[PDB]
Symmetry: D2
Subunit: 317 residues, 4 copies
């Protein structure tokens, strides 16, 4: 039987007997994602080039506007905005949403994969809505995931029931369920980081990477892939297994990737898929944030791969 | 003035006062790319998952069939076919076309960019058409390029007049000229190869890459990117500068990429762009082929970077 | 604020503290409407014509709607123009609603790209017995919801409920129905009558006189204009938009008219009524007829109440 | 073999040994139509309605700009413009085009089919183009036809070789040849006119209409279809056969429809399809015009039906 994003969400929302507010949030977000995908694929570009004689900003406005008018949100955190956005009182709801509306978009000149990443929280405090409401650890997420604008557009959604993958059929504008309750492989064959920072790598990374190229047990060396767009790298890791790394470096000593709307949502998908995400020091999901734009170092992927990296981080204290 | 691939090619064609064949060819191919692109983006997928109750094969068929029926070709060589296809007599025209109908289709599962790569020759003799008509050095190319099915669909076309980029507007099914006469940067800041296979690297490759990561002077190291899909990696090299390698090693003395429909069309675009393309021993475009599926090594991109590769290469020769 | 069909239905769903079954059902129907539009616009026809070198459109339309409603878990009995009997949803997929629909009306004329459409009527199951065809034999008055999709120059979903009639435009770029006209109301009096005058020899005497009065008025005002697309959905939607009258009346040869009561007449009557207009057979309200055959026919006269009433003045004058 | 509008026009142009000018023109036109189709089907309408926080005027803009930039035209006559447009001298070409860019537009509220009507002339001489170049009888058309934005989008193209019908496939944005060398039925069974104005009819119209409803020879009454949108009624008359009328009453002695860009193209399609078009007094194509915006009565469709009307019109003297 055929399933869609909306029908999936309505069905699962009826099992748990909720008010429907998360369903409205998510419906709204799906719609924003379809409009982003449409713009990303360059629909209507002829009109820009005179046939009748900014993208990250548009995607931001799209997510924001849809999320506000879903009536389901109170605090909104975006990659694009300096401060948390506080929903006007009349449109206030119970969820806090952190998001990057178009990740990878600095590199989009070369039509690299891009995507949208989100995490949704139930507002915890009873105080007036503020920036602090977004500062919960990722263990708390109610729902998270991403859309990938690749060769095709795919929505990956993780909740309590696991991870589910919806392909956007552009002919009808519907997300179609194509991969149910997805589990990552226990062990992969591909490793992912920007090796151009090799000079700055601390010795645990350097040893770990060295083991992938020169396995110490005469197994086959891991292949390397780095699109350098977060959504594409994590998704491949999800689909094929392996390991994704963005550790700290001299230019980025607290990591480079953001915790709230990059590392947390991706960590959440990984764990729900049966995988791992770590900073090296702890799980990413357990990091208790202090600033909405703070960075985090991240290693994530197949459990045997992240474990084997943690042993090496262990070897170096 | 708004320009399209069609209007563009008709403009150039009339200037040259040619018969029109090449124009008919390009238009045919173009129509194939839109069809490929629509399927890559998964139009109609709802029907597959049972709403009302292969991609490599499809793309090959679209290209094959559209070329045959352009009345402009006589020998067609494809990644997908063992032998060269000889167009039926009443459909024969003057050109030979070497193509990869969907490059990177191997990894489409992770929705990594895929592409179509093409190379167009004029048949040289009045002989009965055979595989041998495709065995031309890349220098004899009349036109070449690729379609990238990435975050948007773009068609890069190289001819004598240089290299032009058209973005497909999906609203109206036209490729729109968006980048005129593109030239690659003299010197890039990015290197691109599978570093997972370092233990089998050629020692020249070993050393060159080490200088990118560990520069002896006081320069900033190169950033690393490797999509693992040629059209994407070559296209990012074009737009931002840098170097892409798929080189020889002792296990694979002649590399892995196919000369006819991968390396030559890429070498062609890069040279028209004012970039370089080499096997280490010689320019990619000067290799005389003896087998339609023969492999070539390729190092390509910004001229300063390729020249620097060659310097190290020679240090090891 | 931007409103879409899915946000609209959920927002009304919540207000009413419902289970969401009707919401799931409409979503499913709307998904089906989007897949019919795509097919109707001929997306993918190049393949049909050997570009790399099957199903007919009303058939496809039928399978799309059937399948979308079945799998919505909100239906128990389905009645479609295409099938002789009612479909009884398999137990594991049973819900509380009965749906009558014409999946692709006017498709007999798809060869000339005339506007086509999907008409639907939604009913609550009234008995406690195992579901059956009888559950579809409800008067129009019992409708929970009705409407249509018009596949014209653009695709629109006109949805009628207790709260009124809402019109949603399909944005093909994103696959979303956008609310473009809220709480829509027909004019009190139009300037357009609509029927097939080519069959004038066969008109009811009442129909002959009324049409004659619209062409040559005794009060000598301006005559009405004529429009007849030949597609119900298109003719009925124009009527709703520009006001006037649409007639597919009875005659000696066809004394119960020709259009089907359950999935053409009733739903167009309900939309008309929720929009402050009128639908009649001459003898009764379309919505009041108690059906006895799911494929039964009714005569239908609808539109501006000043126009319809005016037809009844003539109708009653001919008894 | 599959055929497209571009491919078909190219091969007919090559046949005729022409210079490519009319092909360039038709492609610019075809492109504009795709852009008109797209906006008429309401792509982007969510953006108008505030998702991120005219149509006849736009359509005219698209045809206008696409024809200017085609360099194939010199005089443009549009329904939307009081005086003819003279193309600026660098874009000047040898053709004159009269068009209705969006027929039926003032009734687009009820989403009635709309269309674009066009007909194309050779310029009259080197004499710096003027409004005069448009004042030519229908017989001088080189090509004509319409695009109908119906349940799907169809382009109908009439030329010396006959009438061919192309279906716009929105997935790939390409016009597919679906009906070759179309001929109208000798006699149909449908008549088409605003019967609402029966009061004002010519006795000949009245009598002819009388014969349709009440055959004196016993036969079946004709059906009546009237959409109120010229392209849709004319297209129904082409596909199914029958008769379309918009004739002269003593109030509109020369009809209502316009000659240059409504009656002529449709009459030229009709004659090329083996049917007829008349004012009653003469053929439509034979009228010599003296104003770009003058009207003309028109009766067109299947020959047997048109001859029937005439036979009656001649009875009424
Ligand atoms: C899958 C998302 C999800 C999962 C669990 C709960 C909820 S919820 O938003 O809190 N309640 C909800 O959707 N109730 C509904 N009743 C009827 C319909 Br139709 S939807 C959402
Ligand atoms: C840029 C494509 C190109 C470049 C060089 C030559 C040719 S050609 O195909 O050999 N000649 C050609 O197309 N002539 C034309 N005549 C009329 C039209 Br409209 S186009 C094409
Ligand atoms: C607008 C149609 C409509 C009107 C009234 C009632 C219903 S209903 O289907 O019976 N209830 C319903 O949807 N409740 C909901 N709870 C949560 C969400 Br999200 S929706 C539908
Ligand atoms: C089919 C329209 C038509 C019919 C007859 C003549 C012409 S034309 O415009 O004068 N010449 C033309 O198209 N020449 C071409 N040469 C090569 C190509 Br590729 S196209 C057009």
């Amino acid at each position: 039987d055929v399933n869609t994003l909306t029908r999936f969400v309505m069905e699962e929302g009826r099992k748990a007997r909720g008010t429907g507010e998360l369903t409205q949030l998510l419906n709204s977000l799906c719609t924003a994602v379809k409009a982003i995908s449409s713009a990303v694929r360059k629909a209507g570009i002829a009109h820009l080039y005179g046939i009748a004689g900014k993208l990250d900003v548009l995607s931001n406005d799209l997510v924001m506007n849809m999320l506000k008018s879903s009536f389901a949100t109170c605090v909104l955190v975006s990659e694009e905005d300096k401060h948390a956005i506080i929903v006007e009182p009349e449109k206030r709801g119970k969820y806090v949403v952190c998001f990057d509306p178009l990740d990878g978009s600095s590199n989009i000149d070369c039509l690299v994969s891009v995507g949208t990443i989100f995490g949704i929280y139930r507002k915890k405090s009873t105080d007036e809505p503020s920036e602090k409401d977004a500062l919960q650890p990722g263990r708390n997420l109610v729902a998270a995931g991403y859309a990938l604008y690749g060769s095709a557009t795919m929505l990956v959604l993780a909740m309590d029931c696991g991870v589910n993958c919806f392909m956007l059929d552009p002919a009808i504008g519907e997300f179609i369920l194509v991969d149910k309750d997805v589990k990552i492989k226990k062990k992969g064959k591909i490793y992912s980081l920007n090796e151009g920072y090799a000079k700055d790598f601390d010795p645990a990374v350097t040893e770990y990477i060295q083991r992938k190229k020169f396995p110490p047990d005469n197994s086959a060396p891991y292949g390397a892939r780095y699109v350098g767009s977060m959504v594409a790298d994590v998704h491949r890791t999800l689909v094929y297994g392996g390991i994704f790394l963005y550790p700290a470096n001299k230019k980025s000593p607290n990591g480079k990737l953001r915790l709230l709307y990059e590392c947390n949502p991706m960590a959440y998908v990984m764990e729900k898929a049966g995988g791992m995400a770590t900073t090296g020091k702890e799980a990413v999901l357990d990091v208790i944030p202090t600033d909405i734009h703070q960075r985090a170092p991240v290693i994530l992927g197949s459990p045997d791969d992240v474990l084997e990296f943690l042993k090496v981080y262990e070897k170096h204290s």
